[model samples]
Target: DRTLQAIGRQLKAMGCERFDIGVRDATTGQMMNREWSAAEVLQNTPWLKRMNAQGNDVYIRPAEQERHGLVLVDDLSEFDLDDMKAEGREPALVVETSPKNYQAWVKVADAAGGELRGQIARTLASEYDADPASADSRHYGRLAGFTNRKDKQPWVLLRESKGKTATAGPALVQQAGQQIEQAQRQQE
Candidate 1:
């Protein structure tokens, strides 16, 4: 899945249908966004690739209000990915954005929406040393097959894409609960 169309098909095979594609300027970080179905993505692949070639980073995320139990933890170290596996939070999808930097989409059951998904982002980011702001449930992940425009044009590659889903184990829910609980207390 090294081309835009191929990645779209892979995402479809992974059970994701709709997606929001973001085109961001390499220098300025100004971005334009579009939402498309997996089929529409294939139809527009040619155009998207050209935009990516022109020093724009192309990113993708589920367009659904609920993220289908997928939590994207961004800006993780190569070591972090392994740590996740060790923790039994294996990702359904993994993308290498640049040399040694990876992003993972881990599926957690009952995390389709609400605090579960958001807190999973928080919990995972905290544990993985991922970008703190990546705790957004609606966050974008760099689309594979595109170049990472923020630096030397390194192509993003799909490392792994699996078809199964997993649940948030007790440890995650217990930890996630404490974070939001502390969030409420700090606000109070």
Candidate 2:
């Protein structure tokens, strides 16, 4: 899987020392699972279930979709940016006529992600102009939501990871217990 290999390359090049890959059923719009498709490596070191294993970096709705219509996107990198311009780069994958398909698109996007790097290399090799530096940099994934009026089909939302900042982590908890002092000082 090039997604695996490409990510692995990035990890190694960045001297990540450790990293992980995963998949989630983002279509349901819930963050319930606390398990790993594979465990994430921390600081090129130990494995942890969570991204940080401390509850940081969360899911969120991005601006482009938040402004125009009610839309939710997961794994935004699936949609090709060059193709979404007609909608003003709106990152909405859900449409009024095909809500069910909208859900399907999300699933397709997640599943479609394999070793993307290998695919790119093959494409470039076929043309006999493969640039080692740029081949894998371009993301290949499905776009969800906005239907092509001309073709009458939905496009995947690829710009997901790029356009928006990763959502912040859950709020911190403070256990102060009781603030009241239990002292016995009766009046006479």
Candidate 3:
């Protein structure tokens, strides 16, 4: 589909070399993670067609954890794009996981330190009322252009900006880390 082509272009812009796909069970809310080449997926293989017809939600692993520098904001439904901007953590990419729910990706190179990346993700998630548990390094996100299965609606791409690396820079992460440290010290 043309949507797949759009997704392919966007991934290329981000310099993504490899990605994976998964199928999500609607009843159990569990995912069957599998690695599929871009070509295999884009070709509309019988496997994907069968899964989609069965009302299974599909997802993608856009960035490899140990390889790419990124942080995820999961299940951000109560907020909007403005809310993300207000929190000083504009998403590098935003995907609509469900009707109102969204997942935001914030790029954070390892140059910012893994601890700092985690702290920044936590801070943003806390501010945005997202799931802090999603701040892990290896978490996958819902695939854009794929059906969500909840309402059988496509997981559309809400926002993407070429040439942008991250919404929050290393300095902001450092600041957040310091604030977290200070709060911990005060409680002790």
The numbered model that scores best in lDDT is 1
How far is 15's C-alpha from truth in model 3 (Å)?
Answer: 3.6
Off by more than 4 A, model 2: 20-22, 31-188
- Candidate 2 is scored at a TM of 0.18
88-144 per-residue lDDT for model 3 (tens digits): 566667777777777877765434456666677777678777887887656677666
Clashing pairs in 1: none
The ten-residue window of minimal lDDT in model 3 covers 9-18
Show pairs that collide, candidate 3.
none
User: What is the model-wide C-alpha lDDT for candidate 3?
Assistant: 0.65
Query: TM-scores of the models, in the given order?
Result: 0.84, 0.18, 0.72
Candidate 1 structure quality by residue, lDDT tens digits, 1-188: 35964486457534666788889988898988988887887788888888888878888888865347778889987778878888888878888889888888887763455576788888788888889887888888888887777765677888878745644444566776777788889975
Error (Å) of candidate 2 at residue 116 is: 33
Q: Which candidate is the best by TM-score?
A: 1
lDDT by residue (6-87, candidate 2, tens digit) is 3233222222122122222334433332222111422322222233233221221112111111112221221332233232
Q: Which stretches of candidate 3 lie over 4 Å from their true place?
A: 36-46, 62-66, 77-79, 86-88, 110-116, 152-158, 161-163, 172-188
